[PDB]
Write a protein that binds this ligand. Structure first.
Ligand SMILES: O=C(Nc1c[nH]nc1-c1nc2cc(CN3CCOCC3)ccc2[nH]1)NC1CC1
Length: 273
């Protein structure tokens, strides 16, 4: 599965900032629907950096994976454009953007039932991938996207969706993998080729730390080299100020790779609170 979209059917509107070796843009895809009616659609346009064109293989292996999947809490991928010289991904556009900047903007206005439901939606998608023995590899708060904000008056919850895996950590330089600590599991630092279903659970715990602290970045004050010793010393994550979900964060972030519980178990612990 690898749909192709013509460059003449994609318009580029506003930029949305840089990213992990990519550049983000809002745009419109003009497609022809039934009865001969053109059907414009707001889309997300993820352009790979031309300077890093060597990562085009994993850049497209990420799109081929998400185009095969249909889940409520997964960002849909419409296709791929070879728009001129650049390689571009076309995805479902979410209105409210990244979750990490949403937690930081409304840090004191986010109830704990809000964070609990968001964690349920994220754990739902991770259970779907685990059920279908699929590995994500880049589960972080910056990749989580909010399509609907909380509306207690209507009774509908907030709605989050996880984006594409992006560039796999197996092909990233050792310089860049150490700077991703503690999102990269400890076993992947000593051996980048140890990608596993258990590696996502570690990132799920690190992401649960982000939402529980309100957008704060763990180990941000530490440089790349001190992060490397953080793992060798077997240090655990300092519990956030709220200190609610911190008990579950420690279980998901266990240094033994096979001790990480399944997401069917995690879904139970979130409903038991
Ligand atoms: O895949 C990603 N994002 C998206 C996939 N589909 N749609 C998006 C996306 N959509 C975005 C939309 C905005 C617009 N603002 C959001 C909050 O403040 C008001 C408007 C900003 C960034 C956005 N990213 N990665 C994120 C950029 C690093």
């Amino acid at each position: 599965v690898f749909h192709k979209i013509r460059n003449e059917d994609l318009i580029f509107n506003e930029s949305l900032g840089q990213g992990t070796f990519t550049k983000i843009f809002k745009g419109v895809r003009r497609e022809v629907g039934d009865y001969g009616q053109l059907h414009e659609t707001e889309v997300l346009l993820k352009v790979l950096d031309k300077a890093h064109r060597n990562y085009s293989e994993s850049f497209f292996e990420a799109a081929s994976m998400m185009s095969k999947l249909s889940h409520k809490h997964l960002v849909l991928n419409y296709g791929v454009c070879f728009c001129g010289d650049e390689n571009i991904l076309v995805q479902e556009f979410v209105k409210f953007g990244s979750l990490d900047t949403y937690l930081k903007k409304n840090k004191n206005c986010i109830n704990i039932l809000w964070k609990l439901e968001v964690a349920k939606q994220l754990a739902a998608a991770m259970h779907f991938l685990e059920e279908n023995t699929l590995i994500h590899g880049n589960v972080c708060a910056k990749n989580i996207l909010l399509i609907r904000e909380e509306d207690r008056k209507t009774g509908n919850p907030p709605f989050i969706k996880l984006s594409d895996p992006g560039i796999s950590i197996t092909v990233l330089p050792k310089d860049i993998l150490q700077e991703r600590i503690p999102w990269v599991p400890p076993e992947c630092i000593e051996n980048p080729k140890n990608l596993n279903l258990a590696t996502d659970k570690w990132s799920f715990g690190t992401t649960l730390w982000e939402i529980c602290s309100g957008g704060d970045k763990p180990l941000s004050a530490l440089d790349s080299q001190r992060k490397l010793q953080f793992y060798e010393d077997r240090h655990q994550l300092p519990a956030p100020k709220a200190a609610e979900l911190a008990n579950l964060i420690n279980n998901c972030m266990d240094y033994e790779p096979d001790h990480r519980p399944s997401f069917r178990a995690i879904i139970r612990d979130l409903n038991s609170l």
